Amino acid sequence: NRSLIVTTLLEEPFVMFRKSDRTLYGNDRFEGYCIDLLKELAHILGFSYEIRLVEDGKYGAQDDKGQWNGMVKELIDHKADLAVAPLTITHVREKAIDFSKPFMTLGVSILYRKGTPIDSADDLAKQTKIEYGAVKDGATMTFFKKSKISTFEKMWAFMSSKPSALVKNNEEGIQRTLTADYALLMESTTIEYITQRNCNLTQIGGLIDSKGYGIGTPMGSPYRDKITIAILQLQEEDKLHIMKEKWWRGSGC
Amino acid sequence: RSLIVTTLLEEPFVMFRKSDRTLYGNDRFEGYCIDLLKELAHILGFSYEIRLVEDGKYGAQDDKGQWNGMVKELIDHKADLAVAPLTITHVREKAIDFSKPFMTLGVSILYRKGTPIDSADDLAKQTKIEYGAVKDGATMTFFKKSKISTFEKMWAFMSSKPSALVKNNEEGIQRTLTADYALLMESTTIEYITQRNCNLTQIGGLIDSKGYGIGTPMGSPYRDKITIAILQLQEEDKLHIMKEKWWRGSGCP
Amino acid sequence: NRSLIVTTLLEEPFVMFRKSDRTLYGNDRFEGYCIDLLKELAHILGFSYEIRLVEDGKYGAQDDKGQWNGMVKELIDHKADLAVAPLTITHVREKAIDFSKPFMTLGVSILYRKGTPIDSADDLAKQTKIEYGAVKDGATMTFFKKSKISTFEKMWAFMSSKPSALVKNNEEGIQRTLTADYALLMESTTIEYITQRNCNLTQIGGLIDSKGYGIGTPMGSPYRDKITIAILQLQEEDKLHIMKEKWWRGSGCP
Amino acid sequence: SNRSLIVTTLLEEPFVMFRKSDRTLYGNDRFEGYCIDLLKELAHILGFSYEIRLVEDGKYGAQDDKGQWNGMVKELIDHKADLAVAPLTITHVREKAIDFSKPFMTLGVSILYRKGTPIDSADDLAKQTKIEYGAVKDGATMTFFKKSKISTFEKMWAFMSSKPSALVKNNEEGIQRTLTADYALLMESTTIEYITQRNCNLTQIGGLIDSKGYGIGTPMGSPYRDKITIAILQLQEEDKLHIMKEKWWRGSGC
Numbered sequence A: 001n002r003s004l005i006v007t008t009l010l011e012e013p014f015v016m017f018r019k020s021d022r023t024l025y026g027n028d029r030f031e032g033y034c035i036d037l038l039k040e041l042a043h044i045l046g047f048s049y050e051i052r053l054v055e056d057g058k059y060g061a062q063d064d065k066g067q068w069n070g071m072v073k074e075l076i077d078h079k080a081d082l083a084v085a086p087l088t089i090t091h092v093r094e095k096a097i098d099f100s101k102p103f104m105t106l107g108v109s110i111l112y113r114k115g116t117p118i119d120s121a122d123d124l125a126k127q128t129k130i131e132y133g134a135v136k137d138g139a140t141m142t143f144f145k146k147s148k149i150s151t152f153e154k155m156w157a158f159m160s161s162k163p164s165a166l167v168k169n170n171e172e173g174i175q176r177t178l179t180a181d182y183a184l185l186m187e188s189t190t191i192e193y194i195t196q197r198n199c200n201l202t203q204i205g206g207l208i209d210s211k212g213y214g215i216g217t218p219m220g221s222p223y224r225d226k227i228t229i230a231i232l233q234l235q236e237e238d239k240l241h242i243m244k245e246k247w248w249r250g251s252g253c
Numbered sequence B: 001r002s003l004i005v006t007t008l009l010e011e012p013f014v015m016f017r018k019s020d021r022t023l024y025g026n027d028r029f030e031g032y033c034i035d036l037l038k039e040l041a042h043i044l045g046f047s048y049e050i051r052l053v054e055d056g057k058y059g060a061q062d063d064k065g066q067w068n069g070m071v072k073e074l075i076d077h078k079a080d081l082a083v084a085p086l087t088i089t090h091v092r093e094k095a096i097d098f099s100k101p102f103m104t105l106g107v108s109i110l111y112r113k114g115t116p117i118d119s120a121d122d123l124a125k126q127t128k129i130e131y132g133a134v135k136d137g138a139t140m141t142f143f144k145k146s147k148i149s150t151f152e153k154m155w156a157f158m159s160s161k162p163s164a165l166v167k168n169n170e171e172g173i174q175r176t177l178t179a180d181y182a183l184l185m186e187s188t189t190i191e192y193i194t195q196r197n198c199n200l201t202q203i204g205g206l207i208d209s210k211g212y213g214i215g216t217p218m219g220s221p222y223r224d225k226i227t228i229a230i231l232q233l234q235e236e237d238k239l240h241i242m243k244e245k246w247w248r249g250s251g252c253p
Numbered sequence C: 001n002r003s004l005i006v007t008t009l010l011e012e013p014f015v016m017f018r019k020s021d022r023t024l025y026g027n028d029r030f031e032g033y034c035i036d037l038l039k040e041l042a043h044i045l046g047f048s049y050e051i052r053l054v055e056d057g058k059y060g061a062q063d064d065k066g067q068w069n070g071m072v073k074e075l076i077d078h079k080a081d082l083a084v085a086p087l088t089i090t091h092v093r094e095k096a097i098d099f100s101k102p103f104m105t106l107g108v109s110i111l112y113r114k115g116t117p118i119d120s121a122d123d124l125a126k127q128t129k130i131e132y133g134a135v136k137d138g139a140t141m142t143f144f145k146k147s148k149i150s151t152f153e154k155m156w157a158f159m160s161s162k163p164s165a166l167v168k169n170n171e172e173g174i175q176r177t178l179t180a181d182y183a184l185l186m187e188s189t190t191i192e193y194i195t196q197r198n199c200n201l202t203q204i205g206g207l208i209d210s211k212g213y214g215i216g217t218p219m220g221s222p223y224r225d226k227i228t229i230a231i232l233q234l235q236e237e238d239k240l241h242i243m244k245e246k247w248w249r250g251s252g253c254p
Numbered sequence D: 001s002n003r004s005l006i007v008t009t010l011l012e013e014p015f016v017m018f019r020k021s022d023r024t025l026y027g028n029d030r031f032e033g034y035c036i037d038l039l040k041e042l043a044h045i046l047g048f049s050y051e052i053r054l055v056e057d058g059k060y061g062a063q064d065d066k067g068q069w070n071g072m073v074k075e076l077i078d079h080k081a082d083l084a085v086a087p088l089t090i091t092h093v094r095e096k097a098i099d100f101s102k103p104f105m106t107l108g109v110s111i112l113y114r115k116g117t118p119i120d121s122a123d124d125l126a127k128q129t130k131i132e133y134g135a136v137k138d139g140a141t142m143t144f145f146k147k148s149k150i151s152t153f154e155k156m157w158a159f160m161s162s163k164p165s166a167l168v169k170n171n172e173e174g175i176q177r178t179l180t181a182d183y184a185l186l187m188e189s190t191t192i193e194y195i196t197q198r199n200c201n202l203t204q205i206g207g208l209i210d211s212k213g214y215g216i217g218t219p220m221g222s223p224y225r226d227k228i229t230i231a232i233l234q235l236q237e238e239d240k241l242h243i244m245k246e247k248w249w250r251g252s253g254c
Ligand SMILES: N[C@@H](CCC(=O)O)C(=O)O
Pocket: A059, A060, A086, A087, A088, A089, A134, A135, A137, A138, A139, A140, A141, A185, A186, A187
């Protein structure tokens, strides 16, 4: 019964440190949507596991020499059996790792202060006053870096140049939108979570694309297909809807 | 000690049966759901009376948040069961309960044969051919809430053109026959209509995948009883029979 | 070389030789529900394949030694990668091979001529005038042979006795039901098919049990879960209920 | 009710057993077995916490002269427990004092006895008188014999009810009696299957005398019985009770 190593990262409301009056340790430290999903997978498949936060705190992207970092790298180097996180399924990633079928669908959109004229990526790309960016070495950054749409190449040209447009993680980005004249390009279900809690913030425009989160495994993993089946089972039983309603609030706004 | 069953007229699910000597009460009806409902009362032993829903609608929420149609009857405890082709949706689950599904369906397109229109994207790209859905049903709500770019575009259209949203299927079917109109309609009804009308066809495949379930007010102890009874009928492979029975039918050269 | 080998057998309307004037070869020889299912599975999963009829024409059962025959044996001996057929998933066969999730439901029931008093397996079990049996070395036979239920043991003891009550295949059992005083223990979806083509036969009673057909693989095969995922996709696209209507449709009886 | 549900059960191999350890265990962690795994699946599917309590009198449950119950059935009647999770037999008389889930296991009464003897059926035992036989006191097998009107089983009850010693306190006493004296135990078939795979000098005599099932027990009106039935059907559909049975019915030899 060897324990599977699960790689992940802190990201509200998917993976969080649970509140306690003493120092917690091991798996007991964590709670959130992806923790509940992991618990379901472990139950259905019958495995035990050890959660390990990815050291560099990244989701994963390729450098110019094609080397990966983040959770994707942990899977490639067979340091982890599974990545259980809001890990975006993308063509470039499917070349290096395997994914389950998606457990949640989302798309790229914009987080910004309420009360302004702007209503689309178009408006940001036109102007230089309002700064904008995305999480460094995640799928949204890669989306822009790869885009052939004029508006998005324009936006990448910006993000790529401005030293601090690319933020370390979502939290740093959300604080930037509250602290400065800055809009964050961010995945839509996280926006949904934030705007039900911070009434100062809103989504700008709609979804720029449509994609999904999946459980990541190393290529050739003998678990990936069973995990797909389990996700399809949870879906059929309405369990992912229940899990989302559990973690998305709360009250406000 | 009898249950009030809310429904509406819809072939081949609920129909006024043909006879000479005027019929009263439950005797007024035949159809797939009528048979289904008989099989459920046998298994669970209850008495009931069918009541057609006044506004003729399935159910959707207004801006204010009030529901109408059968969904509203259950909310208001004006009915015990909704026995009809009532689509299980995550939105409705917030307001009422459903049994496990008794039939699968997905949104798809009903249009005349022999055109070049091949998918929803084809309808969304143009404006000569109009298109719509049944007002205040699940398919309308699907387009209204959609975050997918093509379906948002379609929703802008339907939502704007007068009379693109039809009062019921029959009126939508008639608009498909007499005008340049495509109806966004559930696949099991499309199946029923296209083997009776050889000049109509399903365009594309399923846009989504859902089922029909028996509706109850939230918390009702019958929901689970009805699920057990539906499972029983599935083990006795009796529902697939009931379907073949009401779906006939001589075909199209 | 890496094409998958598919074992199957002829069984209307699942797998049949296509009618043509010009001689057909290879996979093009075949048509039917399981052939359409196979094409869909191959599209989804991305494989090419070669269909081969199982030599002994049997589905599969175990002799007294413990040795299997039919399609089950082809899988056990790693002679085929998949069994694509109306192959009944049973707990007994699960000990030797693996199955996908089911793509169709069925149960054992009774095929007999119309116009008699018989209405249940118990009516058959009480009386010796009317002969009855099942396809030899299939799941229905095995169900009776393994049953611990008194009535089915009784029925097994009867079938087991009659020299020719255990028929070679469905087509033979169908003919014996037509020409002798004989009832065939047969899977319900086949009865459905037959009773709509032959208005002098009918199903007697309901289902005795409830089971499914699944694709068989050798035990431990990675294709097993892949095939399940592909079946779930076809179910989401509601393609199997349609495939079924395509192959079972026809003019009924008065 | 309460927050954690109270589960009544009793020690019966291989359904519920004390797990092995080199320290004193406590609470739910004391237990292992088929019915413990089932309970774990139910608790996960329904989302409840629970506390297992062994039934004080160690009985399954029967009615005395008045209708006074004992054993697990009694714990449910009196609402001392929310569920009974055990190889609890579904019978008419119990169905009138408590509710049961759909069955999670099918079984029948049969005979456990030493190998070798010419004994071959209940009839054989009923005639003769040297070989004693009995059943577990205040269990469903005892009650079946008491209430029977079949000649052979009436004779058998006549014996068992006359002897002070025929009826044993539990399966374990009875099994030991079978190994200790010329004695046959009337016992449920899946327990016989477990025992005969471990005790190679014991065997089943004859077949199953009836056919019934085990179900999860709840007090009448429990808000949990329907959800539990749906859970068991769900587990069955995934082959999980087959897997669970294979896990606990192991042994070696025979
Ligand atoms: N979910 C993203 C990180 C967030 C983002 O890029 O917006 C990923 O998998 O890379």
